[model samples]
Target: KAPLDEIADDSFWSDETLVKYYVNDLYSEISVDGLQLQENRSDNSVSAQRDKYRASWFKFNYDMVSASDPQDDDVWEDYYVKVRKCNRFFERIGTSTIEESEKSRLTGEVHFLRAMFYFEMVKRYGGVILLDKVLTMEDNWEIPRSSEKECYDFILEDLKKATEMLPASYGSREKGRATKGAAYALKSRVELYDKRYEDVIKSCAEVYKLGYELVDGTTPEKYRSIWWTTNKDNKEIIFDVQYKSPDVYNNMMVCNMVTYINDKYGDRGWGGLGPTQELIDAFEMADGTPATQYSQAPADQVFDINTCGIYEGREPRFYANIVFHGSQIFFNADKGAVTVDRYLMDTPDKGDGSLTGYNVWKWIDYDNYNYPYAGAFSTNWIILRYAEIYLNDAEARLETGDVEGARKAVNMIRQRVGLPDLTESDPEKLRELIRKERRIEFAFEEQRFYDVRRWKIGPETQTTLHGVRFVSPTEFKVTKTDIRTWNDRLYLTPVPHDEIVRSSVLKQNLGY
Candidate 1:
């Protein structure tokens, strides 16, 4: 009876069981990716923090928010929890005997997950503790913030380990598993954000060499077909926070951030958010000239020639990105016949098409992106994409005296958008062009605020310079609306004063 009990116990405590438990623990928690991307339109996840990015986009400007001790508690709590959980698994698991290859893959998988968490922490919170190994509670308690550089180095080290361990791809049952491409793409993104442009170029190139292409319409509809949920595995999605059907719901980009097509006009949703007129005017005309950007001409003459003159010819992606009132959207099932009204939150203009001007078209399911049951979206939230890599490469190439390379990179994007060829190559001129393209291309995916910060173009967009006012601030009060350009000192976002009050160690960003 004692020997029988021993055999049962051994079977129950096998290596497979141990691995299953370890993996379950690794996934039993909420991830930063889950937190940061929950609400693209607002900082819905933070307790008291106001989303300056949202406020800036709607108000078309920036302002400082309070960032004074215990306000930092939530962030501190979440990030450290991630680090500690990772440490616990690595320390206890020592090693497993489930096929040396499988063991190695599992090990790499956890490292990737762990590194991803730390990377998320450092990007927003600055330097963080880089706890590589397991720490007892006493040891963990006193860990000070590591330098951001050290934190980044630690993440890269982990990613390198992950790249070696993880499989190239996983089974359909494990659809969202991290792959080698995922690791490299993420590294490329981190490098780009940190201003290590050369590193960005190299890492991104390696990802590209993995044979991934933009998930443009290639299935029946060609590249556009990739927009649906059915196409999530398409070569375009470098890395994303995946949600499976009936189990986890889609993020608010579906519920709130997007506009619904009205039924009468062929859609069943309300365009909740609209693109700013400033953003619309930022697009280059087919002829590749800035209409209002060059001079405050009659704003009514918005789109002129298609491919001939200034403010005339432009690219196709421009039209794809912008959804004007009553624009034709050809759905797969109802193609050729269905022309949806991709209108804005406001009423349309008859002859004066300058009233807020354009609506966002990056994510609107014309057939089913509406109420009651917003249909399953196959579109993965592209945390990092080839377009960004192209932009990064172009920006750096221009910086390093390869104006032609920069132009080519930019032109590829422009050409996809149906714009005429560009011939400008001056650094300052090219920089403006690059920023404008990013605005139109990425639009509501949440890049505008970052663009203003990195290029130091805050002052230019927000200039209080004379000869800039079309209607006085007084006139705006009477009409209850008017376009106001950005002014100086609008770059750095105040770190929400309450954040600093939550933790004395946390410092608010300057110019509050």
Candidate 2:
């Protein structure tokens, strides 16, 4: 049989020996799982062009202004490339002589990946092109967007197919592969986003049935420890891109690119990204009320003068996910808090000076995290975990009149933070709570941007922006101004104007 053009004439894919390479290529694409959380640019200044756009994205949530061209192609292209593999795998393999089990397994893997890609697309873009069948050039250059329902149907169909074919769980040697439960978990997530509460609750229950749990403990063992490089392969990680320690790895985005005062980490820190006052306001006390709701809340509660309570008993995940100035838990919990004091810089230009701002501590293994070669941590970038499934259940339940179910679902996440079970289960009340919980729990995990969009809170979150200040050690002085904001239409990035112009069939997203 003649080989297809995209499929190489003498490609290793044709040979069993070379097939592993193709699979590894799939893993490479999968590897980008965590960097999106970071300001993945060379420029360290907070307002650098590449990351400024992304910073504006999270800062404003959805008010981001769309350029007349394609923007934020990391996810856009990444999904399409992976999806192409699934389409190709579906097309071939039947005629090939590979093991039925192996081929079926690979096919299931591809379906899982495709579902994941489309899930991101729908969540961010609202709805997307449902390209279930591989397309030919003649199919049309400019395909119109699919309705949210149609796109969701396509994603669910792919997940259902994957659910049947994938194993319940792959062994250690085959870790990172999607299993049946992963499919269910992702389905639950998508359903909740679609506002199908009953479906969300059911799908999450299916995931729970497969056996996943929040590690119950105190002192960051359950919250912070699971994210450590040494603990990445633990039970909770449902799916993440694999990053081998000391050999293969990535900066958890925004490292060295973000700005900090000389009084903080060192003199040469980059002021790349900063959380807004609005984001800081989102974190509430142990009580189910906003921290701002507290009368004793500090003038700069979120960005406190001293890094005292910021790292203390505030929230479990906050400690796990935030590396404040002098809060260096990796070296010594006591000294960790001390080291965070060094990196505090209130001045934007000369940030090595004052005590202000926090660092993104999502998947970083500071002990082994460094320049030239950062490899101490061998954890895969967790793309999805079981907690999200629960959150989806809660959101969906609230949407569908399962108010109690929703409250219980939200309570589970809160409980992990060492907070009491929720007392208020009102749909709108719990809805906002769930949204903030996601921000603090998944902060710097690349969830905040999408969460803002989905909750329709982007407009509220995007107003007022500022970047980290640069301060000098021993001498607190301001040096730079990191500017940020959200523009209207930030929810929908402008489809590439060129793509629309090139294809008579393609239409730009509304307003863009």
Candidate 3:
């Protein structure tokens, strides 16, 4: 009779089940890849559709609204929900019959993911409730927020363990998993954010030892080739969010990269996101000098609507990434139709046009165009890369008083882009130069949005958004198109209202 009792068996924790749990716990489904591509635009960035939610960042209308509300927040609820899954995997996988080597590798991945989850939260919310383990019914639900320092320590500890257990690279079958480089690279970012300059330097040094290097973008075509779909597997990518067409995908950049092709390419583009005139002005001239960075337009320069040469003599990255009037679309060119005018000509209509009369073609893959629906592109989203390591090393070195080392690191990035080395030795000036280099090199990759906040210069640097109207090529004018509403309180977002209501122990961020 005892044996006849219905069994809830040990078979539940099979090898297959452990694998399933590990796979399911991955946060790729809720990653910030496409969601954050346009999350941090400023006057130097704008969306074609003013009504899109991301446009609010450029307009400065997001403060105290969806931007800070916990109920409406993605980083709080979404990240924590994934964090719990990571905990559950860690709890259950310990008892599985999987091999020790496999278990150790999987454990490292879980730790890396959980650490990233917490890092995302801490960077935004300062100290958040640290949920390292799965809670039982007997456990308390009202855990208070930890201090920022404690959160960083927890993340660093997790990363240290992850680095210890994870391999530097996996074979082709397991290519996308976290590696030793990823853990160390992430450590550098966390340390840089915390102003732990020496730690950042050490972390970056470890990353460089891993042998990742910048993809040379010294020419327009070579630069464009780096972001091609076929090349996403290149060595430059450190950690990239992997996607497969008809499996899991997103249309963020695919839909935003074009003007209007009337379904010629695929779905007509929303033209929702494009580079701002301010960003255009940020590009250094061909001579590697700050030519148009100031407010006043150069006397010799003028915009021509039909035959614009205003973008000439700028850095090659400008020509490679930005789509202006006469620039050829890759698809159209392959079809023997070159030089499609994005403005003042045979432009396709997609409900909204470019707000700044320019568009971004950086991440759109030529082969992935014309999907029958959204989320149908399989282009991998690069999360971290080697170029960023160089920049991180440069910033930390400058911060820690190694001027010559900082210049060497920054110079490597400049050289890849065919620009001359930066020679500023003053720590203050070198710091500004490195930040500016980051702004130019990583534009539209969603770095600026966080960088401004991290540097505490949001109020000064993000106050005004600008755009241009092409009246005639020779007579265009730049105008202030939007305003940023920033205050000290915006530095951290409020804990979600539902979370606060659900448990009183979680305090809202200061002033929210």
Candidate 4:
């Protein structure tokens, strides 16, 4: 036999080294776990173009971004490909010669991956196609879809199994791999989404007891540090898709930073997403008062963009996560704070001016300016964090009538940002408080899109977006940026047309 012909042979599966490589390759599935200016798809932000279009596609591209077409939601093909590796791993690993100890951990990681993939599928297509045993081209494609609850049941089962099989912790070299903490953290999220408040409470409670805690630092800077490359493996991270530079990296940093071509700086990348006025106007005052820009009194909320008076005294997170007309991009050793000219004049050539007059400040790495390619950075994409678990715990507790428990869980998040503890007693009011916390805390972390859908608050939240502009050096205006459409039909993504065509048993969602 030719030396290369051993691929997938029984001998290949029997070798621990080869099997390990197979497991390593499967790790790429979680690469889909990061956020890269995905806020453009939410009311929190918009995508930019020099020519002028603050990407309203998320709200407006109804026909092109539909059930049948090629949009980000068309993951039926990609996710199924990932699911196959998981199914095959289980089929072969049992018979392989790898030690039981090693195999158990491997099995747990793959279990988590399968659960993750299916959960993503269910998020898009409510009734997902489930293929438990190994599937092949020889198998029929006419398998009926599982009910929404049935899919969640399977995913949760995998998560529960993962929690048992996975270790509580991994060594530094093995840090990126799944742990018991990761499994439980993910469990809480799934439970919260399914509205199984009791389970959410349990899962979140487990995560907190497992020794995860929020990272400590000053308010806004603390928030920015949470996402920096310097902060990888920090306490707040429960799980994130891992990356290493040069050999394996992601364009996350470059995709959302300023273009040197425009700013004439050493920095070189096309800024992909821009924060919207809707999000800007949502930040509360330092005293926990909501910013009332639309107040009949002319809250003067941002009337003085130039004076920095307009932007002063906002919440700590507001200063951390966003860059407005007169905000610092980064601090320099010699020169001090470096403020970029985002809207110096109304003449249209201040460089590739930000469409919404703001850029996401969450992921930019101030440590490196030698950006050559879009994919030239290595920073872990924190998928699940302890803070999110805290919020989830609060939401779940509130839903189950544990108002006091809910307030306690959310207070930690508030105090971390220097905001006072919430003392509200009413469930609905606490519900509003927790929701606002989620919106502000996870602003650009890619949480809001799913949030609006699941909470069914799209009508009010997904209205016309606004962008900031210069009325003069002394003045500013919050003008209409883009109008988007929202209807109940968008609550769940439709099954891809190809899937329906390939398998007649699959049904498209009701909207399409």
Candidate 5:
């Protein structure tokens, strides 16, 4: 038998090992978990690229990228390994004597996981080689890429099966496992990206029927409450990657969330990524006007360091997601530790001048500021949420010419944040409005990066990223921060050269 045959043998798979070992191992793959979120890249969305080479890619200077050129072969190999292992499990698990219900549950979970893996690959590379079954040693290794449409169809078929087999909800111990709603949510996003608007509507409706609702963030306290580590598993989250501290299976937040030497609370952070001024300007005022509309200064005027007019009276989401000058950093009632001030450009805690004037506050847990590295707070990375489903549904409705229906969907999200209704009547105008809402609603959460590509607006939207430079409390200037290079070919990341070399049937992406 070949090495893969030995690993896939029934002797290697006990119920305990399959669930507790193999599955968990697959979850940690950089392709599945870390790289997508952990490694920051540049553009208007993020200030510092977490990895230097990633910065080059963000600028569209792919030639300047020194590492992970075409992505590390190891990461690509790992995902294929996961695909094979999942197929093997499905092919062999039926022969086991595990209880019928448990087997069915496992079937749904693996099917959903497999589809997710494929969707990640499909979106990055137009069409990927679809490995539908476990291959024997005698089988040919060279397989050509499938058409993009074919890949989406394959993923949808798996998700459809997953939704049928999965339970709507799992018990307390199994809380983070895949569910029927998760399958539907994944289907909805897949359809939306594939430009099948009607199918997106159908899939999102199915997810809504499973009882997921947006968490109200109407007030400042409520806005912050929605992101509290204690509430990370709330109903708003349709699917998330689970993490727990003191356990090997968790994420690194202190490294990303904590600002450097926040000595007021004896905490520290890297300020790894910061929000751009372009993003800050995108948020609306409390009364539903654009933030720029309320600005007292001229369109091109640069204010001194004392400026505060532009930041005041913004929406609840602005307060929830950003830590700007004069904003509260933390409040500890027991220790009588008062809210710390950002204090103009005088404060040096904003991560080595690489961060923008504003810092990301969304995923940081204020309560765990003083925790040790290995035991730092664990916040589940929300991958899909109720708000996203609504946004996708709204876009689909607009595209399908259901203007009133689109308004209804957009308004649901607006009301959750205490904003007035979106009154746009034209489909083209409403479509842009919905896209902007998605930018603010899901900012700093890895949504915008993919969104700009899918909307086919990358050239205009991502070219010139900007940031606010603080001169004084009363003055600041929006400066041209980063220039991104874009080509029609960048819509999809190129296939790894190693993959092309190893497979006779594989083809390199154009303009690579």
Candidate 6:
């Protein structure tokens, strides 16, 4: 019998309001791991602190990453906890009497959530314990790892179900809920990662028919606007992790902001991640062709040092994403716009900013960061957006022997950023071109490390880290930041030693 003072635990599922609240909690539970300094694991950006001192960061870039790594333990242990919660949601929903329409919608949302957590494991661990039912602690602890093929198939199964039940868009009252577009977007990502070329094409095609497009404006502002919290509902976003301050928040601002900017206000930023010269060089010169950035410094006058040339002709994205010595930062208005001197060339230590020649300018969240919260802010982090979907289609079409179609898809991304369309004809050349484009387009967006692994280019991309430094007060040059080692074993992070300890059925990845 239900107690007079409190309802039975089973009866808790009967209330639609409480069930809905439980679903909302899943949002925070599945929040993306992208917002942190994950780029330390890639050549795109170097972390001043994590790379310099943290064991997880150090191992990822410089040595063998193993089950014993702290990050692996955290992800393996916590994500399963999150995945189990998703399983419990299903168990309760299956028995509860919530409205049928609401059940389908909520079920679809949980499916998307479950897909993400499993994908995180699949990428790092290569197949994982795939459980759908909520098992009691006493029921079983010894589940074997699923095959990678089976894992991908399982995620797609959920995503297809999500597409069937989710809507095209949600109302303002229910902003950030997963939708049909989001499902297909994630499907496109999963298929692309699995090298299921045709499926990626089909998934991206579905997203194309849906109402998602790039946010329009001009140059860097247009590129930067999509990241601001004010534009969280912008159509370009298919799915994003929701963060609302006063209740929920993230430390991205202080983690990546220039040290001086943070000190001027809160002394909060780490002055920590700096974009690598390799990434800076990936950006094309303004006429939509490649050129050496340091060599052309006199033209764009884009260098923090006596650039020897200007970068006025570089891609608008180059302008948008980089914060060099001479670039203007928009933190305070009394000074109009403040200049960044990362190397302290024409200024004081500015709280010791990005160690590389350039600092990342995107994801600043300037418009909405609360003065009260200091380092913490509520800007949502995008997990998938249209630019990536379009690029996914481009890659998929290329693999499917549709180079013409692939070039056109990539062109859409270029035109939006004020660059001329690609004219490369050789499939081999176009493949490399698309890879380069993806690098510049999505730099520091949590894709590079996995991409480098999947492409098997770690030996080339992971071997060295470089940055620019001031040779003098007015002159600077590219310099070696650090040397690194790459072991093939890092291709798949080890199944946690802790997991293996708990289950004899689990085996460590090769070379661990």
Name the candidate that leads on TM-score: 6
The runs of at least 3 residues in candidate 2 whose Cα sits more than 4 Å from the true structure, single-residue gaps closed, are 1-15, 31-64, 74-78, 133-142, 244-250, 253-273, 286-312, 329-338, 342-347, 351-356, 367-379, 466-488
Per-prediction TM-score to the true structure, in the order listed: 0.70, 0.80, 0.88, 0.90, 0.87, 0.91
- Cα RMSD, each candidate: 8.1, 5.5, 4.8, 3.9, 3.9, 4.2
Instruction: Give the clash count for each candidate.
Output: 49, 55, 7, 0, 16, 14
Task: Mark the 10 consecutive residues where model 4 has the least summed lDDT.
Answer: 54-63
lDDT of 1 by residue, 1-512 (tens): 01111233444323666665555556544332211221222210110111323343233222322343212224555766667767765754554446767767777877887887787666555566578675655563444556778888888888888877876677878766678878877776666656777777787677767776665421223334344566567777666654322322223333222233434232232233344434545666655665544234343333322232322343444454655443555443432324333233223232112223334455444333333343563334556566666777777777767789889877776665446656886888987787667666666564554556556565555432111111321111011122235543334333445445655565544444
Error of 3 at 21 (Å): 5.4
- CA lDDT of each candidate? 0.51, 0.57, 0.69, 0.72, 0.68, 0.74
Tell how far residue 86 is off in model 2, in angstroms. 2.1
Q: How well is each residue in 106-139 modelled by candidate 5, as lDDT tens digits? A: 7888889889888877877778888988888898
lDDT of 2 at 279: 43
Clashes of 2: 55
User: Of models 2 and 5, which has the larger lDDT?
Assistant: 5
For model 4, how does the per-residue alpha-carbon lDDT over 1-512 read when each residue is reduced to its tens digit? 11121366658777888877787777766654222433566788666652343333352323235665535444677888788778888877778888999999999999988998888878766778887776668988688888989988999999999999999898877778888999999888888888989999999878878888787634777777877766776888888874543332226665566553234344455566677777777788888887756312222444665344557788788888887666655463233455655555212244444677777776565432343433425655778888998899999999999999999999998888888789999998899999989998898776787888789887876667777666666566666655666767767776767767776677788767
Ranking by TM-score: 6, 4, 3, 5, 2, 1
- Give the C-alpha miss distance for residue 363 in model 2, angstroms: 1.5
Scored against the true structure, residue 153 in model 6 reaches a CA lDDT of 96
Specify the poorest-scoring 10-residue window by lDDT in model 6: 1-10
Q: Over all chains combined, what TM-score does candidate 1 have? A: 0.70
What would the per-residue lDDT of candidate 2 be over residues 1-512, giving only the tens digit for each residue? Answer: 11233556644455664555555555565545333532321111122223334544333232343544334555565677667766766776566667879878777777777788788667756566677667787786467777878888888888888888988887778776788888888877777667677777778877787877776534444566666666766767777765553322234343323344233343333433344333444555554444432212333423333432433345556555555444553353223322444333334324322212445555655544442222243444677787788777777777777788878887888886777787775677877777666667666566665666656654455443332332333222222223344544666655555556666766666666
Clashing residue pairs, backbone N/CA/C < 3 A, model 4: none
lDDT of 6 by residue, 1-512 (tens): 11111333657777888788777777678654433545777888776564446575566777656667735637777888788878888877778789999989999999988998888888887888889986777878688888999999999999989899888987879887889998899999999999999999989888889988887634777788888877776889888875443432235655666565433343455655678777877788777878664522332232443344434567778877887766776644333355665444322233345667566777765433544333425546788889998899999999899999999999888888878889988999999888888988888678888889888998988866666666455566566665777888888877777778888888778887
